Amino acid sequence: HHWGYGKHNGPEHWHKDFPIAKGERQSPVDIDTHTAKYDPSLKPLSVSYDQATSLRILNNGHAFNVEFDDSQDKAVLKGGPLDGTYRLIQFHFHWGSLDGQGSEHTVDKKKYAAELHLVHWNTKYGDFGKAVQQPDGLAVLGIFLKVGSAKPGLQKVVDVLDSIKTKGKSADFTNFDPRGLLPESLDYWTYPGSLTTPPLLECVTWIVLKEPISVSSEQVLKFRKLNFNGEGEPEELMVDNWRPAQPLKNRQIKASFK
Ligand SMILES: NC(=O)[C@H](CO)NC(=O)CNOCc1ccc(S(N)(=O)=O)cc1
Ligand SMILES: Cc1ccc(S(N)(=O)=O)cc1
Ligand SMILES: [Zn+2]
């Protein structure tokens, strides 16, 4: 894998090694709020993170992942558009070089400063690697970030980033409560899509919350001090690690709310 977010290896190049990049259910997409249909059959989301066990934070050269113990049903997503039980494996963000870009999904073409992805896999497939081979394998909960007031529950993440500056660095990251990253409302849009990074597998039920969270300028500035490069390599700031909106094709975006 040599894909990334540069001019020479960014999203417009990915199709050469991952031809599904041009597929029928790629993510992210623009959410056209007036075209999304309210679906009264959609259930409230059930986010059950009370027993979540965070373990570690990793700079993987594209973003940082906060990893969870997914060896039991400890932190699960169910309800909403989903059938069955999806276990939280990791969360990460996508963000920009400036506050006017960074999100992957857009809302009426609006780009947010960043987007949080809480990644869950369907327990009926047993392991994450098996789940990504299935059309209903993953559920990703997407949350927009705007710049304003600080998000108190984000600060523990911000403060460990200095210890994982470069690709391949990890740090212990226990006892982090991801409930501190949610907005007040669980109103959402949903559609069938894909992973937004290679291998771009078409295995995701996307659940994108309408209500953004607010983070401070200082918090997002610390995201932008991370590096895509490994230790001792030429410094490349980890910024603009987002894929732009892809064609909606033969898909419907449904709203949980009127
Ligand atoms: N684990 C596995 O057996 C293989 C090989 O390592 N991995 C994958 O086939 C997919 N890995 O997918 C990560 C991933 C990528 C993108 C997202 S996003 N940005 O759509 O939430 C969320 C997870
Ligand atoms: C040099 C190079 C550029 C881009 C890729 S890709 N198709 O994985 O994005 C691989 C190698
Ligand atoms: Zn993501």
UniProtKB/Swiss-Prot annotation:
The keyword Membrane applies. It catalyses: hydrogencarbonate + H(+) = CO2 + H2O; urea = cyanamide + H2O. Its EC number is 4.2.1.1, 4.2.1.69. Changing residue 16 to E: In Jogjakarta. It is an enzyme of class 4 (lyase). Changing residue 196 to D/E: Strongly reduced activity, but enhanced zinc affinity. Activated by X-ray, histamine, L-adrenaline, L- and D-phenylalanine, L- and D-histidine, L-His-OMe and beta-Ala-His (carnosine). Residues 1-257 form the Alpha-carbonic anhydrase domain. InterPro entries: CA_dom (IPR001148), CA_dom_sf (IPR036398), Carbonic_anhydrase_a-class (IPR023561), Carbonic_anhydrase_a-class_CS (IPR018338). One of its GO terms (molecular function) is zinc ion binding. Substrate binds at residues 196-197. Changing residue 60 to T: Reduced activity. Changing residue 3 to A: Impaired activity, not rescued by 4-methylimidazole (4-MI). The record marks 5, 60, 65 as: Fine-tunes the proton-transfer properties of H-64. Interacts with SLC4A4. Interaction with SLC4A7 regulates SLC4A7 transporter activity. Interacts with SLC26A6 isoform 4 (via C-terminus cytoplasmic domain). This is Carbonic anhydrase 2.
